[PDB]
Subunit: 256 residues, 4 copies
């Protein structure tokens, strides 16, 4: 059985869609009718469960494996993407791109090594750029690019400086590419979540779930669905006049 919505007929790639925010994004886009390529690095069982969840709810989805931040990453990602799309649609067209996959590594600024710096930049900033560069060859007019940033680009947090740097680089993609792609009517935007419960063990550290909840003006951490809802909107026809924007989905974390 197939369910129809505002994205029926469209195709989407959500990077790191096996858990947390990316999972909720994929589910929401699939629910809306988009054929969703559910990307992962090593969590294939989690990805399959997301893809199945979409398919069971009457949507369409498949999984693609790609380790990002290593040589040949984009090549591997697009080989699997295009194959799955061509198989299911008879074409390689990609309408919606969500750059969600990312890494974090807390620590004192004095302990950051060049290797740690390289990894952060490689996964959070370089890969999103080259994924965008590659998607342009297969993205039709009226397409969508959404990059998942962080409110940590607007709040000083010494233990997260490397991560903030990476996301501040990522935010520059929306600015410069929105102008580049204007005549093709492809919108490029950044969405900045605040603290969001991704399920991970480090959110179940009892000295962490506190203070994080105090960041938001609402006094809670976000559910991933709250962020997914914003991304789904940006991917839609209703967000056609928004491009090159920084979209604050932090639940009032950026209030100073």
């Amino acid at each position: 059985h197939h369910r129809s919505g505002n994205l029926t007929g469209k195709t989407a790639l959500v990077t790191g869609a096996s858990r947390g925010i990316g999972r909720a994004i994929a589910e929401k886009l699939g629910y809306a009718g988009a054929l969703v390529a559910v990307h992962y690095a090593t969590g294939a069982d989690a990805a399959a469960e997301v893809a199945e969840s979409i398919e069971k709810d009457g949507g369409r989805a498949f999984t693609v494996k790609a380790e990002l931040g290593v040589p040949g990453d984009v090549d591997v990602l697009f080989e699997g993407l295009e194959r799955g799309l061509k198989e299911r649609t008879g074409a390689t067209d990609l309408d919606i791109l969500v750059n969600n996959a990312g890494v974090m590594a807390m620590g004192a600024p004095e302990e950051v090594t060049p290797e740690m710096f390289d990894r952060m930049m490689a996964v959070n900033a370089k890969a999103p750029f080259f994924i965008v560069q590659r998607a342009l060859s297969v993205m039709p007019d009226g397409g969508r690019i959404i990059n998942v940033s962080s409110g940590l680009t607007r709040v000083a947090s010494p233990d997260q400086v490397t991560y903030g740097m990476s996301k501040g680089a990522l935010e520059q993609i929306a600015l410069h590419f929105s102008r580049h792609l204007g005549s093709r009517r492809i919108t490029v935007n950044s969405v900045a979540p605040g603290s969001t419960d991704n399920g991970s063990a480090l959110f179940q550290i009892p000295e962490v779930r506190e203070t994080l909840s105090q960041l938001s003006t609402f006094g809670e951490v976000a559910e991933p669905a709250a962020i997914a809802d914003v991304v789904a909107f940006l991917a839609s026809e209703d967000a056609r006049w928004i491009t090159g924007a920084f979209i604050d989905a932090s639940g009032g974390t950026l209030l100073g």
Copy 2:
């Protein structure tokens, strides 16, 4: 629609962007109060248009920027909402009504400045203040700003000032209203065809079209679609935010 059971006030809803907002909120299930100053026939067209497509709407007259304005507005609003729903509850507030008066800054009189500030900043503040007594948890406040708070134009400086004051409402009330889960946000359209004869003059249309990265002026619906999303459950985690709905006008 996702706004079934909700109520909404859209100020300046008789024409232009406010009309599109009211029409889009009605379609989604909200009982819309269509506000106007002197466009009585126009407001009634919008209210009828909402009812026609299966929704519920009514009109409320209030000239803003003069003493007792908010009193008049909320007298008409609460009376109409109670007659229709049995409560004075206001879920959604859109501060859309506004004036513009372009001209050299050397020529701005104090009275022009008072008028600009009275309608674009003061009234929205006192409208928000009065709405707090009737707005349930999970409510929505949306203030229509302008890209001109980020793009320098000497001819529009007092307009800019008024909208910069308006934008402060979202910042400060978001913190105030956090524990009631009422979101407060600013929306900034770019150049938008409001139906006025101005946007039909080919040479004015061409200059304005060039401001957006798309090479077009916006249709009102494009702005309404953004406001409709902010009013919804889907934007529960967006508060105190500046939302750029300018179609790439603010790219420098």
Copy 3:
């Protein structure tokens, strides 16, 4: 000093930050007009203090936010400048005078709102407008804002709104005045000891000290030093800018 041969108006110069600004501009060589509302004895102390250290200064009385305010100000200013220099040329304008009135937003009256807007936004706009007729090329306009335009505080919302309007002056007039090489900029102090008895209450001082990343409230001189730089030749390539002089208050 680097301001020798220059003239300067500092509004609200009888006390606090404006006093420090006037004292620092005088020391650098500017003929300073020390403006006040009712602090006549205080203004005279500042003017004397400038002359004592080898500079030139005088006082100008004007209650702002009431009709004819700018007329009174510029009558006194241009008369005093002409008597002292032989011209009415005004090189440096600092819009520093301001009021604050903290309190719950539910309790803001329209008259409180008018007062706030009249003194903090309207007067600075009409002061800039009148200054344009007497300001030579290479001139300077500096508007004292506040970190509260970037930090949400319900108790300060109308203050915030007024300062958000003020900040629009720099954006739009910078473009207007580009070909005259007159720079227009906003400066935002953080919590600053203005000499008032408020900053002596230990528990108020402690709370305010915590806002800065330095754990201290600012001395007025720290703000004046920033304004002094903007007024100088060294800041010729800074226009239309928001200058954060808050000591790390705006770090989120």
Copy 4:
């Protein structure tokens, strides 16, 4: 003969101080009395001429060679810096750090290679981070860190996206380090020049000196001295209440 000013007794490092903006920064800081370490990669003759110019005007300066963006770069930079400082002052203390050195490589977004990306990031963002990390061990309280960004982080320019990304990363240093260093009273700020005539050949392309001049509200490109004057201010006692700030020295380029 020695000239005295507001920075007498202080020491400064200006990266890429052999030409353009860095040269003007060094001259201005030296003129103010700071002992200036004039850094360069391959332009040793230009650096010596800057260091001599400062010394002739009654200041103190020496040159340090270091290629940034390659392994061991920071090690090499600090070996030469500390040696020169210890020789001249008897201590390794560094009061003022200016991260000025940087690269640019225009081009269509579709032509950017990973190697081009790596180089941009390595020189403009990574090296500034590790230079800051290393300077902290030798920077006394009341110190200064100034990073030279660009107005290109606020103006969309498709041909410069990689460069914008690098500078957007660089701007995150000021935000996170200002909070980290608050109790040590070290200020960390970003300064964003607009178009500035650095002398380079690419500024003498006649199809380039046009349009660039139109960026500023003043209708000219900046002289390097105009930017240096802003940096000198930030390095001074008068800028003690400014930290974590983005300082717009673009001559009204950011007006939209």
